[PDB]
Design a protein around this ligand. Structure first.
Ligand SMILES: *[C@@H]1O[C@H](CO)[C@@H](O)[C@H](O)[C@H]1NC(C)=O
Lengths: 33, 49
């Protein structure tokens, strides 16, 4: 979406790139740089 | 008594972790224009193509 600044708009959808059939204890998502 | 005769014995789980990836197209080829009850395991194909 060609944008410049401060426009959190845009409407679309998503496909499952990967389904890792792990089924593990998941509630923490530390996202780091 | 001791000649080399090696064996690898196997075992499957009592489901400690469910299956990973399931069966492939153990299949024959395609068909056409004549209704064929066929199975995709999720798309029971019954009717003409
Ligand atoms: C973590 O995953 C295991 C997998 O069997 C499950 O049995 C266990 O209950 C999970 N732990 C929590 C806190 O949900």
């Amino acid at each position: 979406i060609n944008l410049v600044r401060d426009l959190p708009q845009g409407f679309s959808a998503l496909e499952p790139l990967v389904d890792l059939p792990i089924g593990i204890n998941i509630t923490r998502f530390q996202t780091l740089l | 008594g001791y000649q080399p005769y090696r064996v690898v014995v196997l075992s499957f789980e009592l489901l400690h972790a469910p299956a990973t990836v399931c069966g492939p197209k153990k299949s024959t080829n395609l068909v056409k224009n004549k209704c064929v009850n066929f199975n995709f395991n999720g798309l029971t194909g019954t009717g003409v193509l």
